[PDB]
Amino acid sequence: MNLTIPFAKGHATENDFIIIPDEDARLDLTPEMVVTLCDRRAGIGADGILRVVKAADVEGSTVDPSLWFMDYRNADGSLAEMCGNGVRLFAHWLYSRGLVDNTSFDIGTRAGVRHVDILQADQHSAQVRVDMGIPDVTGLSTCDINGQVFAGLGVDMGNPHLACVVPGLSASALADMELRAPTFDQEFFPHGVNVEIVTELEDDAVSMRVWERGVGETRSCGTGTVAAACAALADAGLGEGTVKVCVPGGEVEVQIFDDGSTLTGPSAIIALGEVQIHHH
């Protein structure tokens, strides 16, 4: 006995999502079902899910009930407290379908409210700026990736990061290295952690790869790019700045003040349809 769910597919710097419209709040998917859908072969395939729902109808939220809420699920069914690339696609979706009518608006997330600015938008593409709030640098920790250690900044962007700027690493060296789920200090990161490997600041740019909690390597990670841009700035001895972060799925521009931070990048809406899945 299978359900038929309307959906759209999209990405933001090739970090890709399945959008489930759910204003009547009748598709709070179980984690098994999330897994099934984010399986490319068995389902559709994605890095995770954006279920579109009002804050009024989302369990555990206490943000303004009148806002749209970005119910993000990771590909393993795991919840997460924020998703930078997600927020951009979610904004793109809402605007482009006329579910809001300003280029500038607030969205609810599991880390609270996030403001967005639509800079450019079609049916299929957009550029979105996100107020990401203040990066809270949590301390210093390390990880091991494939019997080699790196030292990083803990950063809280809503969710946890370990941003390891690597002294001397070229971009081509970085493209080459082979990643395995890192191992980290579980007292420091009791809930798991997103890890970013980063090149040092140069021409106001860094290059990054990332091993997402819940998911594995992704072609981009928006909260992680901001984490990386802190780390790169801190390693150059600044704490304000504008940094272009280069990820396997593209480019974003992060901006860091003392009062806050922003993440500006593209978003794309690739497909619409309906999908089959089994309850059991």
Place this chain on the structure above:
Amino acid sequence: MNLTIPFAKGHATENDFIIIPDEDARLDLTPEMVVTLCDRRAGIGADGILRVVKAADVEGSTVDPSLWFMDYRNADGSLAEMCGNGVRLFAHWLYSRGLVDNTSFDIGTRAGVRHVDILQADQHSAQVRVDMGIPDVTGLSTCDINGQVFAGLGVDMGNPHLACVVPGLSASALADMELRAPTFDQEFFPHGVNVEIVTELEDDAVSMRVWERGVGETRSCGTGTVAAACAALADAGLGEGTVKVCVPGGEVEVQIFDDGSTLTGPSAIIALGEVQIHHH
């Protein structure tokens, strides 16, 4: 300037396809476009494409123009001469949408005509039997996978195979081994080759993994299962038989006579929609 293409997503033992309806024969996709679509993040994601077209309107075919033709493309844009799992999903599609009206019919492929029998069918599931023709054992060759050599049968099933039955290998040992694109004799396989690693016959069953030409590891390979079932039977000293082949995405039953061979397995239709893609 982007095209909007109606499509369906489906699989056959988790070897998954994008179905493009194209009776007016106006979507002979270029290989770049195939690649874009079979990219999960950038497009939809699949092991390959089944474009649905009449034999009349397919370049290079000389089969009966009145038949439906399975225009199969691999995920790298590469054409291929047959696709076993594809044929089952293609039959499922045609029947279930009422584009044929018999449970038993002929389909055109790049290896010529293939007969099919629909055994069970819904909107969403089916069991299909395929007349695969005669396995032609081409000789003996070897390959290397990750600095280790295996010896195999060359088999022509339409397309080329190297079926390596491995003396002593358990299923759990097989689940464990780590695969890399094999290296093979290019005089023997001037066009590339599908490689199957197989366990010895036991309880009329073998277990198999496969590194598809054009694609890489797949959860199943229908022509390869028949290749594997020959090899396993030959290594047990028979040349007729009924063999259950176990693949990471499930199970199929292959049957071998002297007059021919059949492949019976499941098929599923997971989603319908429309997708965006760029000409340039």
